[PDB]
Amino acid sequence: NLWQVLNKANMFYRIYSGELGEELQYLLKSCCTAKEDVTTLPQIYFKNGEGYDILVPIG
RNA sequence: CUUAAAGAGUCAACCCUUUGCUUAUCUUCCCUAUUUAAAUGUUAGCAGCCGCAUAGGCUG
């Protein structure tokens, strides 16, 4: 699948630095998005100096 | 307010059987245990006889 080919011989960094094309850089980055959901995830408090931040640790 | 917050692992059982660790052995020679000295500590608390005494006295 795409997971094997993008992960050997540093192929994801090769598409990321555009040795195989800038329009491919676009295709890669079109899939590289940040989708967010905080349900069923741990939510802890970390001290940031006179206050706390709710950190949601993702692996 | 801690990768916070939350959670039933349950069940079941035939390890079997078999067997030759035998064989032969020099332990061995050696040689100073020597010398003293208070048993003291009263070292015994007896035998009769005068008596109701297992109270108290006397006799040696």
From TrEMBL:
It comes from the Viruses. This is Uncharacterized protein. It comes from Vibrio phage ICP1_2004_A.
